[PDB]
Amino acid sequence: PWELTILHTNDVHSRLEQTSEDSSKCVDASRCMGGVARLFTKVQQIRRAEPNVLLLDAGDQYQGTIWFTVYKGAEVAHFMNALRYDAMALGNHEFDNGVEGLIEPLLKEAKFPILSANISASGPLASQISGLYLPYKVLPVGDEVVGIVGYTSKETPFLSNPGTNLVFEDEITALQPEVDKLKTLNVNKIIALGHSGFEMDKLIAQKVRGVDVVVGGHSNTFLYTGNPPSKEVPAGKYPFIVTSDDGRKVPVVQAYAFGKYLGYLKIEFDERGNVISSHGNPILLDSSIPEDPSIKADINKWRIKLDDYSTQELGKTIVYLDGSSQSCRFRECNMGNLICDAMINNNLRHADEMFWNHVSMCILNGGGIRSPIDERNDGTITWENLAAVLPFGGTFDLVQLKGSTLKKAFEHSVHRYGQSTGEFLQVGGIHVVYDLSRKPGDRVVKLDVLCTSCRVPSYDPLKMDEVYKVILPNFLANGGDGFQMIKDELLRHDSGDQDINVVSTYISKMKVIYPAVEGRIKFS
Amino acid sequence: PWELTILHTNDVHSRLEQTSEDSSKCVDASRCMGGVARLFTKVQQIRRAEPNVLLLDAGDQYQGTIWFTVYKGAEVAHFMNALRYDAMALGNHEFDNGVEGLIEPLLKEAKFPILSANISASGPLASQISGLYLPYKVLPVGDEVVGIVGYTSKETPFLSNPGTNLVFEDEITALQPEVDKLKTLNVNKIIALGHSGFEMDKLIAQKVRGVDVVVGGHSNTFLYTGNPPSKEVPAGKYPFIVTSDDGRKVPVVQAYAFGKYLGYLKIEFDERGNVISSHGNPILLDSSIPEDPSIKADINKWRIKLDDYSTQELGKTIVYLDGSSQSCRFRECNMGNLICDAMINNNLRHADEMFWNHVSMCILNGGGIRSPIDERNDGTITWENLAAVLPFGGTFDLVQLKGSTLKKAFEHSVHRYGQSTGEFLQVGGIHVVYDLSRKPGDRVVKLDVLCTSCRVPSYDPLKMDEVYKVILPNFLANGGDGFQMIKDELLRHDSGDQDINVVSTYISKMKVIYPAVEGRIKFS
Ligand SMILES: O=c1[nH]cnc2c1ncn2[C@@H]1O[C@H](COP(=O)(O)O)[C@@H](O)[C@H]1O
Ligand SMILES: O=c1[nH]cnc2c1ncn2[C@@H]1O[C@H](COP(=O)(O)O)[C@@H](O)[C@H]1O
Ligand SMILES: [Ca+2]
Ligand SMILES: [Ca+2]
Ligand SMILES: [Zn+2]
Ligand SMILES: [Zn+2]
Ligand SMILES: [Zn+2]
Ligand SMILES: [Zn+2]
């Protein structure tokens, strides 16, 4: 039997440096995790021990920290090249800077193939991008070859900025003919590597005949066999076994996010390319693994431009930006309005005749706003100033919520009002009126929301049965601050852009800001 | 006696082309007025007849039409040079593009002196601008000399964008020592040429010892002796005679605005430079005076780039811009909100620790919004599209109104509601609630306004005795649409930027707009 070791990462999201246990800024070095210098140490160790190794990335290296803000993907090409990745699938966030922000920095500079079989181009873009990404690549491994076939979320137009010259095809429709073609070319060992989420990965393992292994991403899915080594709770065993329509056992793997773990799957194949066995587990990249000194010194050299950028003026405010707890945990605060307005601006996607924009609504825990910004430094706002307001390393995610769920969230917002607790919600595209003299759970007396399916945006009463798109912190999507109803009742969840980066881009665009308190939240 | 003919213009405001009787777009050529080609004909005719002539401009050539938008002052230097102006005073609108937008295009290219005795610079700007404008110039006229001493509104920081490196001194304080200096230099004929308004011009004639004649601007003041030749109603005789503190009779002149008239004042001086007599009248530049063919052909050549610019994309909308009468004369309309938001953005001036901005409030007659803009031309907005929305050639002016006056204006807004009349007001920085079941005059049931004297902008109830700054169309400042209370009760009025240009600059800054209907105007 021919044994292959698959090493894999996904949704690394700009975590070039080691991180805290929750993937935020490293504070206590002796307990920090991940980063590319530590990953290098572990990959090097495995390649010294195992003859047949592939190192794969399932997309979403782009977006997550100031590294991406400043280097715009040049850091991805440089450090993935240094780690000698064998292949990468395109994720949704590889489109955050448009097709031009993908072609240059990443597609032209990567020394490995970049894959997606379900993205097609038209017009002059088709000629410009031809061959810079591939449906698949056949790679030599020892005396054998392995086909790797890519895929990317069909939902990418709603979750990034790919433009109107790319079409994202149904994954299974696009994959099947490519996998059948590889069989005609005597390629009997096939990996599907791609970026659609665990649920789609299981459908691909079930329905795409000839796929031996699925290596996925997007949903930040943690899988594990045995007692978990850290705080992430597994969604299933590692690998997750799907029984295919043709009766094979197909392993499905993912490795959480943020470079905290290295996926590690051993596959035994027979002479005909059938999987005999599969086993493994993600490896926690904790402090017991030393950071490679050479990669660490290069990271520290690249950090100088980040430190310089962090104190540059992004733009100006002519108003005090009130991010005080006394304001933002008790009433509408103009820092809350700014952040929610930045969140909606970040989520303007391709227009369509059925909506002015796909999403119009924002909620934000007031306890997540951690500092004001004074306007008396000649109005200057810097990244360092925003990092004081938003220090947690979160994202502003897209969810679908029934109106009933959102009403329950606004009741929870004020269920114990008056104690300076963090659950009080700041908003955008929502007008709420509370009556605090009513019983907890029955304090919301008006709730109006900005339409999407309209050419002129206007407010209408919230409907209990209707599903709304809402932008909100990942902290709330995951049920933080007691918002268990959001976690338990949401219909869709996709991870969005870095919190600081969303606000910095908005301020840079606007140049001069003056957010008001305007009656989004009232008390009767 | 030595006779001087003073020819003068003021507040020409980018009217390079001939205009309608109301200074808007020329439609019926055979009845059009003004423009630089016609002015050339008349100035040439007078210079053939009168030996001692000066042609003077009292400021505010900048701002008013697409000429300024595109050529940014290069058209002012070119066509004032072609007319051989002898001198110009700086007006407030010469600062609209900052000090850099004054130095280059105008101060470096004018072939005549540009004057202001009450503007001082500090820091590196002082070295950069030294000598490019002058307090005064002594000009030879025949065998004599005449001193011309400039001045500019002390209020310019509130009415334009001069920056924080220029100081505007009290006019009389600055002028007196310059006029006394000219006497020490054997200059006994002195003209004060400047841009502070008729009321300040009369104070200068009264108090500045040695001034023989005041040639002013800013207030668009029409003066005439006899039956007026057109629709402008005179504010007084031409010249207006002030009795000075030293007992001399000092003529004060102005010539309306928009290049419709050429001021014409004959002065007789004795050997010692005392005024013996003064007489004249502005000359209506009507169609009985032919446009100079050479200047007309040059105007037509310069127009090609304006025609090209008028169909270029300024920016995009992702929302229908509802400028329909059915919306904007009956309820809050998102085109109204856009225009008012552009008006406030245009009036962001130098911050100060006593206010976030000096003005926060806007009102706009809904009958002044003349077209929607469809978002389905790939979202494009052009200048031509904005000129359909705002076709009247107006300005967005700054006034001071008591709260009582503004309440009366909001009552008038709905006094005959339901007839699709133009007086219904669109707003910014104001939240109004009407109850139409009440009697006319008592329909306003809530009126809240955005603070200025605050670090965090918020809404408070309007106070009847407090004075508010408001941005509004010149049509309303002049009592149009039956708003007689505004004209009769306002405390201050300064003319602002061209209506189209205000909206075009805002859209260009924003890049992508999505104005909502958000509850600025409600009905109970
Ligand atoms: O990781 C996080 N992300 C976002 N908000 C957080 C996080 N951890 C704490 N918070 C907020 O911080 C509040 C507690 O702050 P404290 O009352 O100042 O200790 C919570 O109620 C949350 O609103
Ligand atoms: O010169 C002008 N400037 C601004 N608005 C004007 C002017 N002339 C007319 N209007 C507006 O046009 C309305 C009349 O439009 P109509 O009902 O469509 O004929 C008036 O009630 C005003 O609101
Ligand atoms: Ca196989
Ligand atoms: Ca004299
Ligand atoms: Zn991701
Ligand atoms: Zn993703
Ligand atoms: Zn003017
Ligand atoms: Zn002026």
Descriptive notes:
- 2 copies of one chain form a homodimer.
- Chain A is an alpha/beta fold.
- The first copy, chain A, has 16 helices and 27 strands.
- In chain A, the strands form 7 sheets. In chain A, strands 1, 2, 3, 4, 13, 14 and 15 form a 7-stranded mixed beta sheet that branches. In chain A, strands 6-7-9-10-12-11 form a 6-stranded mixed beta sheet, with helices on one face. In chain A, strands 23-22-21-27 form a 4-stranded mixed beta sheet, with helices on one face.
- In chain A, α1 runs antiparallel to α9 (293-309) and α11 (334-346) crosses α16.
- Chain A is globular, with a radius of gyration of 24 Å.
- The termini of chain A are far apart.
- The interface between A and B is medium-sized, with 29 and 29 residues.
- The structure holds inosinic acid (IMP) (2 copies), calcium ion (CA) (2 copies) and zinc ion (4 copies).
- Residues 60, 91-93, 195, 218 of chain B line the site of one zinc ion.
- Chains A, B: Its cofactor is Zn(2+).
- Chains A, B: Zn(2+) 1 binds at residues 11, 13, 60.
